[PDB]
Amino acid sequence: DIVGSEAFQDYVTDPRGLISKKDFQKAMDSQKQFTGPEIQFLLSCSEA
Amino acid sequence: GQWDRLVLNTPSFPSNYWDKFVKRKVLDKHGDIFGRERIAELLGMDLAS
């Protein structure tokens, strides 16, 4: 669902469409879809 | 629907109607998801003020 979120699309900076790790953390925190402990699990599962 | 967009930024939107906190309720409901500052600008209100 987060791909269609404007509050994360604006945080997307790379022209190729890539989103920085810190920016993607801040996007989750702003959208409040996932809580703090879940943030780390999503970060780990993300393609580092 | 297009015409109703004029009173969004006006400071007299809840006039001639019982409720005067409709903008505040809309802000408190949609700020966390669509951006609190964006909704404040849309409704013509200042959170700091």
mmCIF file of C-alpha atoms in Angstrom:
data_model
loop_
_atom_site.group_PDB
_atom_site.id
_atom_site.type_symbol
_atom_site.label_atom_id
_atom_site.label_comp_id
_atom_site.label_asym_id
_atom_site.label_seq_id
_atom_site.Cartn_x
_atom_site.Cartn_y
_atom_site.Cartn_z
ATOM 1 C CA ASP A 1 0.000 0.000 0.000
ATOM 2 C CA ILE A 2 2.852 2.418 0.788
ATOM 3 C CA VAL A 3 3.847 2.750 -2.888
ATOM 4 C CA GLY A 4 0.761 4.874 -3.565
ATOM 5 C CA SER A 5 1.283 7.033 -0.477
ATOM 6 C CA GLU A 6 2.171 10.625 -1.334
ATOM 7 C CA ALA A 7 3.858 11.076 2.064
ATOM 8 C CA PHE A 8 6.418 8.478 0.925
ATOM 9 C CA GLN A 9 6.497 9.291 -2.799
ATOM 10 C CA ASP A 10 7.612 12.839 -1.979
ATOM 11 C CA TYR A 11 10.347 11.399 0.250
ATOM 12 C CA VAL A 12 11.472 9.372 -2.773
ATOM 13 C CA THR A 13 14.403 11.401 -4.126
ATOM 14 C CA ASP A 14 16.369 9.253 -6.583
ATOM 15 C CA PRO A 15 15.257 9.878 -10.201
ATOM 16 C CA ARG A 16 15.474 6.112 -10.744
ATOM 17 C CA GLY A 17 12.876 5.837 -7.952
ATOM 18 C CA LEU A 18 15.097 4.707 -5.077
ATOM 19 C CA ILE A 19 14.369 5.788 -1.498
ATOM 20 C CA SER A 20 17.081 6.355 1.103
ATOM 21 C CA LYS A 21 17.000 4.141 4.196
ATOM 22 C CA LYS A 22 16.625 7.014 6.668
ATOM 23 C CA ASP A 23 14.041 8.705 4.444
ATOM 24 C CA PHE A 24 12.080 5.427 4.243
ATOM 25 C CA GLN A 25 12.159 5.142 8.045
ATOM 26 C CA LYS A 26 10.868 8.714 8.362
ATOM 27 C CA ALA A 27 8.165 7.945 5.784
ATOM 28 C CA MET A 28 6.895 5.012 7.818
ATOM 29 C CA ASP A 29 6.962 7.097 10.987
ATOM 30 C CA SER A 30 4.983 9.907 9.328
ATOM 31 C CA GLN A 31 2.404 7.559 7.785
ATOM 32 C CA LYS A 32 2.073 5.658 11.111
ATOM 33 C CA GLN A 33 1.358 2.415 9.249
ATOM 34 C CA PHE A 34 3.979 0.470 11.231
ATOM 35 C CA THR A 35 5.090 0.954 14.830
ATOM 36 C CA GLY A 36 8.636 1.506 16.056
ATOM 37 C CA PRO A 37 9.635 -2.092 16.810
ATOM 38 C CA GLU A 38 8.150 -3.117 13.450
ATOM 39 C CA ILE A 39 10.245 -0.434 11.732
ATOM 40 C CA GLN A 40 13.470 -2.336 12.428
ATOM 41 C CA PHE A 41 12.039 -5.619 11.128
ATOM 42 C CA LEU A 42 10.970 -3.905 7.903
ATOM 43 C CA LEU A 43 14.419 -2.307 7.611
ATOM 44 C CA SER A 44 16.063 -5.722 7.987
ATOM 45 C CA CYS A 45 13.764 -7.378 5.441
ATOM 46 C CA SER A 46 14.390 -4.505 3.023
ATOM 47 C CA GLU A 47 16.928 -5.214 0.302
ATOM 48 C CA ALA A 48 19.918 -3.642 2.092
ATOM 49 C CA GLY B 1 -18.052 20.856 -6.018
ATOM 50 C CA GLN B 2 -15.632 23.189 -7.784
ATOM 51 C CA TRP B 3 -17.456 26.245 -6.423
ATOM 52 C CA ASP B 4 -17.274 24.989 -2.821
ATOM 53 C CA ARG B 5 -13.459 25.227 -2.881
ATOM 54 C CA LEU B 6 -13.645 29.000 -2.320
ATOM 55 C CA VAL B 7 -14.721 28.867 1.346
ATOM 56 C CA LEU B 8 -12.033 26.360 2.365
ATOM 57 C CA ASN B 9 -9.429 29.075 3.013
ATOM 58 C CA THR B 10 -11.867 31.701 4.309
ATOM 59 C CA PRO B 11 -11.880 32.483 8.055
ATOM 60 C CA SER B 12 -15.711 32.455 8.111
ATOM 61 C CA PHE B 13 -16.368 28.930 6.828
ATOM 62 C CA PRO B 14 -18.467 27.610 9.777
ATOM 63 C CA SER B 15 -20.718 30.675 9.726
ATOM 64 C CA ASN B 16 -24.508 30.230 9.686
ATOM 65 C CA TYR B 17 -24.147 26.744 11.180
ATOM 66 C CA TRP B 18 -24.030 25.283 14.685
ATOM 67 C CA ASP B 19 -20.527 23.804 14.630
ATOM 68 C CA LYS B 20 -17.476 26.066 14.480
ATOM 69 C CA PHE B 21 -14.760 23.424 15.058
ATOM 70 C CA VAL B 22 -15.283 21.466 11.826
ATOM 71 C CA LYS B 23 -11.888 22.562 10.491
ATOM 72 C CA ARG B 24 -10.219 21.493 13.743
ATOM 73 C CA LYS B 25 -11.886 18.070 13.598
ATOM 74 C CA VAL B 26 -10.903 17.621 9.938
ATOM 75 C CA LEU B 27 -7.315 18.520 10.829
ATOM 76 C CA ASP B 28 -7.202 16.126 13.786
ATOM 77 C CA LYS B 29 -8.643 13.368 11.589
ATOM 78 C CA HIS B 30 -6.589 13.674 8.374
ATOM 79 C CA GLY B 31 -3.324 15.309 9.482
ATOM 80 C CA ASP B 32 -1.439 12.162 10.460
ATOM 81 C CA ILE B 33 -2.053 10.571 7.052
ATOM 82 C CA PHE B 34 -2.227 13.387 4.468
ATOM 83 C CA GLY B 35 0.178 15.748 6.237
ATOM 84 C CA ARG B 36 -0.912 18.037 9.062
ATOM 85 C CA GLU B 37 0.640 21.161 7.530
ATOM 86 C CA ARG B 38 -0.898 20.376 4.131
ATOM 87 C CA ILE B 39 -4.379 20.124 5.659
ATOM 88 C CA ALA B 40 -3.742 23.317 7.634
ATOM 89 C CA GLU B 41 -2.881 25.167 4.417
ATOM 90 C CA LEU B 42 -5.901 23.643 2.657
ATOM 91 C CA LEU B 43 -8.257 24.819 5.415
ATOM 92 C CA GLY B 44 -6.509 28.177 5.845
ATOM 93 C CA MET B 45 -5.627 27.703 9.520
ATOM 94 C CA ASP B 46 -2.353 28.038 11.433
ATOM 95 C CA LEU B 47 -1.528 25.312 13.949
ATOM 96 C CA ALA B 48 1.136 27.484 15.588
ATOM 97 C CA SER B 49 -1.291 30.407 15.836
#
